């Protein structure tokens, strides 16, 4: 009855994605070195730079503003 378990993994590794293949490759190396696998646990974001926008552009969240802050020792 061990063939069913043998065939069980076979049908799983066949359908496992490339993301899993990349993920297990890293985790195999981490446990080889000794690092904890937990912690390795993608970027659906789009960013751009707005040099000197007009004073009317709305301020969305997660916006980083570049600043020229005056010299503290001045």
């Amino acid at each position: 009855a061990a063939a069913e378990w043998i065939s069980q993994q076979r049908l799983s590794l066949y359908r496992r994605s490339e993301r899993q293949e990349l993920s297990e490759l890293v985790k195999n190396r981490m446990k080889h070195l000794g690092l904890p696998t937990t912690g390795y646990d993608h970027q659906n974001t789009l960013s751009y730079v707005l040099i000197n926008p007009p004073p009317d552009t709305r301020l969305e969240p997660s916006d980083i503003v570049y600043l020229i802050r005056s010299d503290p020792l001045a």
Partner: protein, 34 residues
């Protein structure tokens, strides 16, 4: 000849642990126990 019917150390068997590269098709191979 029978006619063709119209209708129908001990090595363990397992996948190699460390695939050297991504895309290496996993084949069930004879493996050492240790």
């Amino acid at each position: 000849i029978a006619p063709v019917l119209e209708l129908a150390v001990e090595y363990v068997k397992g996948y190699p642990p460390n695939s050297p590269y991504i895309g290496s098709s996993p084949t069930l191979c004879h493996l050492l126990p240790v």
